[PDB]
Design an enzyme around this catalytic site. Structure first.
Site, PDB file in Angstrom:
ATOM      1  N   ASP A   1       0.822  -1.205   0.000  1.00 28.11           N
ATOM      2  CA  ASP A   1       0.000   0.000   0.000  1.00 28.11           C
ATOM      3  C   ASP A   1       0.859   1.259   0.000  1.00 28.11           C
ATOM      4  OD1 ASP A   1      -2.003  -1.925   0.284  1.00 28.11           O
ATOM      5  OD2 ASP A   1      -2.039  -1.705   2.467  1.00 28.11           O
TER       6      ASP A   1
ATOM      7  N   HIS B   1      -4.401  -3.783   6.248  1.00 27.04           N
ATOM      8  CA  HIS B   1      -4.251  -4.044   4.818  1.00 27.04           C
ATOM      9  C   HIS B   1      -5.580  -4.569   4.287  1.00 27.04           C
ATOM     10  CE1 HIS B   1      -2.715  -4.911   0.949  1.00 27.04           C
ATOM     11  NE2 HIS B   1      -2.687  -6.221   1.106  1.00 27.04           N
TER      12      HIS B   1
END
Lengths: 334, 459, 485, 241, 194
Positions: free
Chosen positions: A159, A187
């Site tokens: 990310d 996540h």
């Protein structure tokens, strides 16, 4: 020569692992003077595939590689490990309930954590990649109480890198120009990408992404949406998972663990909330911005949190809490 | 926190005076925020008409002024041209602008010059540019994913390269290549600055400086070998012409894949004679396979094995020469210090295994290509490029696929795999190696196969 | 320690009395002996010249003259230090022992035990000892200041480090000085460029024997084309000699380069002259500024350096603080920071000439809600207020049990406003936040209780575990103050 | 370790002083008052003249060897000390003693030379009960030791064996004895009761809690009433407090 | 002057082989085992480790081989021994390799020409001559040392190991007991098959 280290990869037949292994073997992770022993673990049917992988690795003649071990046995695979990368997980099937997915993964990661506890070195470093990464990592850590919790981390670097990419694209720059992006929380689609403290190099000068872009609207709405959905977009276009970028992110994560982060720079990692100054509940696996020295990470303190950030952080903390509760019901019943 | 925007023409007096008032307000007021816009007056009409249509406002004179309700580039609430903003500021804040008309003339010049500065800055950014241009043909292919991370490593060139990359296939492949580009952007490499797709004829290889050519996934059905060979010819001709016309004169072209690699390379060179010297075929993967087979027999690591030579059609009939092959770190009790080496042929007591079994195994590996996976292909291509820029390891032989000009005996006008070193950005053929002569039968077999392939392809 | 040194490598140490006593035997009627007697009989205890002569005479003593001598606790006065420098009796290095009085007294009590180890009467007065020690402090402070300042060679010790620990550290340091001296002497005989740090050349000789670059790094002028004033601190840490002249480099790395390839930096082989002093910049204070009146700076406060570097941004015209401010070439400048001043001093030609436009002069007046008129402070406060109200109402669509809708929503909104106040006392903000969370849970009671309770009665104990608690909570709220509660 | 396990840690000076003092006490006159009460206790039947002549030989030896004593005497006293009931019940600890392979063999080897009739193997005549259940090596850089010693208070080091000349000579002698060609460890290594070695220099804590933890783990849990109910009740009070 | 040469001499190669190897590895020179050099030389033709026990084991196999072949013919029910291991025809030895084989059987010295040729390779030729070496296993005979002197080709030093019967049994005898046990198990299996 430095003594060879033992590195385990689970789910090694999967595409993420397959992509990763070459980066592991070529020194990009541990440096060009660390000999490696690589351990590959999968279910028995994959062993044929796993054997094909082992052969192709031997064909690569990687100088830093001094063994490849393929096994379906945890007692073999987890023996004397130095680093464990937990990529294998049960993927969510259509019509599988989220609770059943959680239970199955809790079973897998409880088993793997117990194998780490019994067989592995207490200094082992454990990286969890298989979704749900945070909850799986927590389940493993609870199953390996003798191992310092700091040894356990889950992959949020993907990310972070995606966010950096999006910023660089918008500004029109290299990824290297961008620094100090933060990913907060799980996540998952609820992950929060924060650039309030990120810096970029423009016209030879370092400037803060809010100042540089000057588009708070687009930073909040479109950037966040793009980052959160980037993986779904990639799957939708390719019809294949993001193996290449996942492998890259994993390599970066491990490399920063091994060398440490550059001075004056921090990285986002998924890590155990105990003692955070930010008022996240303890006993969670949460993502934070961190600095790493001597193979040890520390939290970037003192960063101001605006109410927008605070709200996102509490939302994702709620999600993580619910996940933890659900998983722990199975862990106690298991 | 209040948020405002004003748009200007570089010459507009009242816009400049608005800028003065805005800066006054933002300096003195804690509450006040404003963003700044101006267009060249010619653009202004269109730009503002677009803005007004989107908002459904109805304003035309410069400046235009509106309050944006949450964030920069939200929806706006419209304030009127300069007099209306001055009115608003005077009544709500109590503030007054004090600037003279003469001053407004001067600043109208100053802002003209400011726009000229902006234009020159745009031009200035064009000056700053020194990328490396890379292209990939048949990019819509599984090998391509593994390759890209190795390129992004920068070790290919050194971590000091502005990289611009290009990827080609037809539009259907362009969808997955779009996904590949997305992953490439996400890979966020420090040396990456751009990546691009191509699908269209005129564009290809334009100022290309590196060209990678993969296998094609021939979506056509399983044609006979003769039809497959001939089917390559139109594609090789097209690529050769495009490269010769579009690419940079020093473009490097590397050919890799599991099929007919020598033939494709030869055809390309034929169509692209000038660059042909620049064009090379990757043999390294076969050598790696041979090394691994040897290492398994010996029970050592392939890295200990060195100086394997591949003699033939890379993707077809080849001979693997072990006469120069060396092993390091082996446990002969006739044991040297670090860096001692022993000859593989001397160590392997089973000559029958070498002659029949090893050869048959390699023949199977080459014919099937089964073990030639994405990792190996990528490793071979990347390492070859690395040696081409950096040089090969000193003293170590490499195998490469390259066009014969007679060097040992080999007939001219075919691409053969042969032992080579890389130095000063260029390869040399190790014609001074002793004893590495081939038998007449072996050479006849190897060259005859390539010749027959070439003839059939030309038809 | 002196004796330990003398024994361990056959070194000498001297007290003044040692020389005088030696003279008494070596010739009881020498000039120095005759003077010594004459003074003694006059009660003139060691006029210092006598000791000075005796000491340099002791330097004759072959062991010391060739090899090594140390002197203990001497000079005892600055006047002696001065006259020793006048002869130039000058130690290469000096060490100083810092000790608590408590330790001294404890050692003296062990000396009291030694007094029984002794037998013949001896002077043991702790009172005198304390007096002497105090005056040792008095003189040694001044002596240290002078000698360290001039000669770069003063070192200090803790008496509570064990005598062996101290001896080890002193020996090691001395060997370091030796290695420096010998390597420098070698470079000098080799004629090489060499650093002169801890070679303790006097500042006055250094000034006398500067090279053409004076107190500035030639590497800076040649590579950067900038001036860095090395004088600004005295220390020789980047000071070096070559070919008979002294220079300082601006850093360790510049010094390394100069040592490696001095000819490049050497004049005239360097690419530029040092411009003459009239062209060089100098720093100023309010006193200089007052002397510069009636003019202000050649630029009316706005910092030119940042504006120039900004490619002449209008934004850049923020004025420098006068503390930053300097004259260069007849003309007075100020820039945004001390570091800007440093860059200016390094390369003033980049900046000193300017023609800013008239635009962006505006000095700030910080506006206040009280100072504002009604619509302005209204606007400022309401923007935040309405943002908060908008989110709170729109998202929640609030109601709380028993209250009117109006009551519930208004009270919730007022709390929400407090909870998010940009400048509300933050622990109190979080207190309200907690109350708001409880309110939210209480609104959640409405939905839970309505969804879970059917019109048909259903088995009470098979109700969900929270169900009865939630009901009890609702019922209690019927008879609770919503404001506090 | 003694305090945590609650055992007895003995130092050579103690053994020597106690042995001498007790011998002299027996050799001291059975003066003009009656001895131990002649009740239900079996009195000692020493030879006082044997103890006397032993003490004489000890004095002579220490004259001949400048206060050092023959190994045979010291080992005798150690072996008797270990025979003592406190050692037999609880635990004995020694710091770096015995010091040589021969000394260890003499002390540990059973002076009942049990019948060799088929004892070809490596299990000597030795008593496992006196035999240490644990031995470990502790070692650091000589530089680290030099630093610590020099950092000892000058008062502390005053006249000690740790005054730098004495310290240096003893440190050398320590190395010189324990050749990797031969050490006292070799006796236990031949018993294969393999000792283990921990680096105080790298662990660097002047208290080395880390090593203490490791040693405790290797020893395992103290074979004792780790709390008696009095200790349990007090620890419960400490927790409540 | 030339680099170090030593050989260490004593029991059966045993661990002493390892200890010599360790020494040379510490020194960063060559190690050699003379017996290895014989074995590999013979293996060049042989594809087999010739030598006394290994081929003498074949003697008893003569009887069993013939019985197994009779049973394989009468029992058309085919046998686990169908997968007979690979062997070559005689890669016919020179007198030099003959002498080597006879050395392995006899444990006896050999015509000087061979010893000279090989050991002179190790003195004369690089990398050995620069690197130097320690060797395991040579001379086995005073006859060999005699020839060393008569050529005049010398180590730096000899070393001999002081070891005795129990010590030798401790390592070696268990392995030989395992040899016996496994051979007896094989013979029991042969009884069962018969």
């Amino acid at each position: 020569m430095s003594e060879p280290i033992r590195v385990l990869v689970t789910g090694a037949a999967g595409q993420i692992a397959y992509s990763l292994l070459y980066s592991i073997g070529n020194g990009s992770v541990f440096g060009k003077d660390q000999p490696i022993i690589l351990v590959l673990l999968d279910i028995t049917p994959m062993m044929g595939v796993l054997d094909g992988v082992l052969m192709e690795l031997q064909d690569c003649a990687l100088p830093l590689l001094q063994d490849v071990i393929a096994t379906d046995k945890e007692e073999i695979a987890f023996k004397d490990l130095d680093v464990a990368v937990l990529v294998g997980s049960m993927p969510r099937r259509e019509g599988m309930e989220r609770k059943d997915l959680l239970k199955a993964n809790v079973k897998i990661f409880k088993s793997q954590g117990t194998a780490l506890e019994k067989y592995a070195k207490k200094s082992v470093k454990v990286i969890v990649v298989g979704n749900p990464a945070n909850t799986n990592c927590l389940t493993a850590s609870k199953s390996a109480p003798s191992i310092p919790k700091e040894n356990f981390s889950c992959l949020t670097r993907l990310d972070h890198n995606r966010a950096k990419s999006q910023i660089a694209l918008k500004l029109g720059v290299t990824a290297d120009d961008v620094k100090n992006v933060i990913i907060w929380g799980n996540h998952s689609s609820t992950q929060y990408p924060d650039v309030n403290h990120a810096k970029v190099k423009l016209q030879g000068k370092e400037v803060g992404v809010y100042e540089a872009l000057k588009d708070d609207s687009w930073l909040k709405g479109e950037f966040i949406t793009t980052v959160q959905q980037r993986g779904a977009a990639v799957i939708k276009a390719r019809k294949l998972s993001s193996a290449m970028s996942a492998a890259k992110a994993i390599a970066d994560h491990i490399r920063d663990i091994w060398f440490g982060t550059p001075e004056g720079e921090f990285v986002s990692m998924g890590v155990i909330s105990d003692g955070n100054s930010y008022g996240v509940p303890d006993d969670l696996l949460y993502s934070f911005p961190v600095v790493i020295k001597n193979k040890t990470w520390k939290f970037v303190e003192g960063l101001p949190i605006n109410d927008f950030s605070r709200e996102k952080m509490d939302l994702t903390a709620k999600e993580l809490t619910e996940e933890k509760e659900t998983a722990f019901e199975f862990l106690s019943s298991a | 926190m209040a948020k405002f925007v004003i748009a200007g023409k570089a010459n507009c007096p009242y816009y400049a005076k608005a800028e003065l008032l805005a800066d006054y307000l933002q300096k003195n007021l804690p509450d006040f925020r404003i963003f700044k816009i101006t267009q060249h007056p010619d653009k202004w009409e269109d730009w503002v008409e677009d803005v007004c249509e989107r908002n459904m406002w109805d304003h035309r004179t410069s400046p235009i002024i509106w309050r944006e309700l949450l964030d920069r580039g939200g929806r706006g609430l419209l304030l009127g041209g300069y007099n209306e903003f001055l009115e608003h500021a005077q009544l709500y804040y109590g503030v007054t602008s004090n600037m003279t008309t003469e001053l407004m003339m001067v600043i109208a010049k100053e802002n003209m010059q400011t726009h000229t500065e902006q234009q020159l800055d745009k031009e200035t950014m064009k000056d700053l540019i020194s990328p490396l241009q890379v292209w990939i043909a048949s990019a819509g292919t599984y090998v391509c994913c593994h390759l890209i991370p190795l390129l992004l490593s920068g070790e290919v060139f050194g971590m000091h390269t502005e990289i611009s990359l290009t990827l080609f296939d037809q539009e259907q492949r362009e969808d997955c290549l779009r996904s590949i580009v997305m992953e490439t952007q996400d890979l966020a490499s420090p040396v990456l600055r751009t990546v691009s797709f191509c699908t269209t004829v005129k564009e290809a290889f334009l100022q290309a400086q590196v060209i990678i050519i993969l296998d094609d996934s021939t979506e056509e059905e399983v044609y006979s070998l003769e039809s497959c060979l001939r089917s390559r010819v139109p594609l090789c001709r097209l690529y050769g012409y495009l490269i010769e016309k579009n690419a940079h004169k020093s473009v490097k072209v590397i050919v890799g894949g599991k099929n007919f690699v020598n033939l494709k390379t030869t055809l390309l060179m034929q169509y692209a004679p000038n660059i042909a010297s620049n064009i090379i075929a990757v043999a390294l993967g076969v050598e790696g396979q041979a090394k691994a087979v040897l290492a398994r027999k010996m029970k050592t690591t392939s890295a200990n094995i060195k100086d394997v030579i591949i003699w033939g059609n890379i993707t077809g009939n080849n001979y693997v020469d072990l006469r120069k092959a060396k092993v390091y770190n082996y446990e002969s009790a006739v044991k040297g210090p670090p860096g001692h080496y022993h000859s593989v042929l001397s160590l392997i007591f089973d000559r029958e295994w070498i002659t029949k079994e090893f050869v048959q195994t390699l023949k199977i590996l080459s014919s099937t290509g089964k073990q030639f996976g994405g990792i190996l292909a990528a490793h071979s291509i990347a390492t070859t490029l690395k040696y081409w820029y950096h040089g090969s390891p000193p003293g170590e032989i490499v195998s490469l696929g390259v066009m014969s000009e007679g060097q040992f005996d080999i007939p001219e006008g075919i691409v053969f795999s042969m032992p080579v070193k890389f130095e000063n950005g260029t390869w040399v053929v190790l014609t001074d190696l002793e004893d590495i002569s081939l038998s007449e039968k072996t050479l006849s077999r190897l060259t005859g196969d390539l010749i027959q392939e070439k003839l059939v392809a030309c038809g | 320690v002196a004796k330990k040194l003398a024994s361990d490598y056959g070194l000498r140490c001297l007290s003044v009395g040692d020389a005088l006593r030696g003279m008494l035997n070596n010739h009881p009627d020498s000039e120095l002996s005759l003077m010594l007697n004459w003074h003694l009989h006059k009660g003139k205890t060691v006029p210092d010249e006598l000791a000075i002569q005796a000491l340099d005479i002791s330097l004759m003593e072959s062991v010391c003259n060739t090899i090594g001598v140390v002197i203990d606790g001497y000079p005892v006065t600055p006047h002696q230090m001065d006259l020793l420098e006048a002869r130039s009796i000058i130690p290469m290095v000096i060490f100083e022992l810092h000790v608590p009085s408590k330790e001294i007294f404890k050692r003296l009590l062990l000396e009291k035990k030694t007094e029984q180890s002794m037998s013949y009467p001896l002077h043991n007065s702790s009172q005198i000892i304390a007096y002497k020690n105090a005056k040792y402090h008095k003189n040694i402070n001044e002596i240290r200041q002078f000698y360290q300042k001039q000669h770069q060679n003063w070192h200090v010790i803790d008496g509570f480090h064990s005598k062996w620990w101290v001896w080890n550290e002193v020996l090691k340091d001395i060997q370091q000085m030796n290695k420096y001296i010998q390597t420098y002497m070698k470079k000098i005989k080799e004629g090489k460029a060499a650093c002169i740090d801890k070679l303790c050349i006097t500042p006055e000789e250094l000034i006398a024997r500067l090279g053409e670059f004076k107190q500035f790094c030639p590497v800076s002028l040649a590579e950067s084309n900038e001036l860095i004033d090395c004088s600004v601190t005295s220390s020789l840490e980047f000071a070096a000699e070559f070919r008979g002249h002294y220079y300082k480099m601006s850093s360790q790395e510049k010094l390394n380069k100069f040592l490696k390839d001095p000819e490049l930096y050497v004049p005239p082989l360097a690419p530029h002259p040092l411009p003459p002093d009239d062209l060089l910049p100098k720093r100023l204070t309010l006193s200089e500024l007052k002397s510069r009146f009636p003019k202000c700076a050649e630029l009316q406060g706005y910092c030119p350096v940042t504006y120039q570097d900004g490619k002449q941004r209008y934004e850049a015209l923020v004025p420098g603080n006068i503390r930053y401010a300097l004259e260069y070439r007849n003309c007075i400048y100020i820039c945004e920071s001390e570091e800007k001043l440093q860059k200016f001093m390094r390369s003033p030609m980049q900046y000193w000439n300017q023609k800013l436009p008239r635009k962006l002069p505006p000095l700030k007046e910080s506006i206040h809600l009280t100072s504002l008129p009604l619509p302005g402070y209204l606007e400022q406060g309401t923007a935040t207020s309405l943002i908060k109200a908008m989110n709170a109402a729109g998202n929640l669509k609030p109601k709380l049990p028993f209250l009117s809708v109006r009551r519930s929503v208004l009270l919730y909104i007022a709390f929400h406003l407090k909870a998010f106040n940009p400048k509300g006392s933050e622990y109190s903000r979080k207190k309200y936040k907690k109350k708001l969370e409880q309110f939210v849970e209480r609104c959640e009671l409405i939905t839970y209780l309505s969804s879970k309770m059917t019109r048909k009665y259903k088995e009470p104990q098979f109700r969900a575990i929270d169900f009865d608690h939630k009901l009890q909570t609702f019922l209690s709220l019927k008879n609770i103050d919503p404001v506090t509660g | 370790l003694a305090k945590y396990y609650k055992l007895h840690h003995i130092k050579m000076k103690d053994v020597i002083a106690e042995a001498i003092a007790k011998l002299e006490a027996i050799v001291a006159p059975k003066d003009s008052v009656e001895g131990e009460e002649e009740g239900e206790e079996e009195e000692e039947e020493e030879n006082v003249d044997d103890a006397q002549e032993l003490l004489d030989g000890i004095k002579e030896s220490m004259e001949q060897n400048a206060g050092r004593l023959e190994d045979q005497y010291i080992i005798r006293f150690v072996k008797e000390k270990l025979k003592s009931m406190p050692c037999r019940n609880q635990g004995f600890i020694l710091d770096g003693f015995p010091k040589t392979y021969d000394q260890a063999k003499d002390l540990f080897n059973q002076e009942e030379e049990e019948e060799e009739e088929e004892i070809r193997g490596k299990i000597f005549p030795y008593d496992k009960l006196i035999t240490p259940e644990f031995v470990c090596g502790l070692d650091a850089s000589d530089e680290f030791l030099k630093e610590r010693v020099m950092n000892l208070p000058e008062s502390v080091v005053a006249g000690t064996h740790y005054s730098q000349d004495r310290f240096l000579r003893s440190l050398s002698h320590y190395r010189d004895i324990n050749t990797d060609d031969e050490t006292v460890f070799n006796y236990f290594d031949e018993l294969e009761i393999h000792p283990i070695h921990i680096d105080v220099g790298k662990l660097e804590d002047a208290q080395n809690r880390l090593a203490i933890k490791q040693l405790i783990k290797e020893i395992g849990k103290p074979r004792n009433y780790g709390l008696t109910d009095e200790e349990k009740a007090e620890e419960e009070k400490k927790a409540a407090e | 002057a030339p680099p170090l040469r030593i050989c260490l001499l004593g029991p059966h190669g045993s661990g002493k082989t390892v200890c010599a190897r360790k020494l040379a590895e510490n020194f960063g020179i060559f190690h050699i085992q003379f017996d290895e050099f014989l074995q590999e030389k013979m293996l060049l033709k042989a594809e087999r480790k010739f030598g006394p026990e290994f081929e003498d084991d074949s003697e008893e196999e003569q009887l069993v081989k013939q019985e197994l072949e009779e049973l394989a013919a009468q029992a058309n029910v085919k046998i686990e021994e169908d997968t007979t291991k690979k062997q070559l025809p005689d890669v016919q030895l020179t007198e030099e390799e003959e002498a080597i084989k006879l050395s392995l059987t006899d444990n006896e010295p050999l015509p000087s020409e061979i010893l000279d040729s090989i050991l002179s390779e190790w003195w004369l030729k690089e990398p050995i001559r620069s690197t130097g070496f320690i060797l395991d296993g040579f001379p086995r005979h005073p006859e060999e040392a005699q020839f060393l002197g008569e050529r005049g080709f010398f180590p730096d030093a000899a070393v001999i190991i002081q070891v005795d019967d129990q010590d030798i049994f401790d390592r070696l005898l268990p392995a030989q007991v395992q040899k016996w046990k496994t051979k007896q198990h094989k013979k029991l299996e042969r009884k069962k098959l018969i």
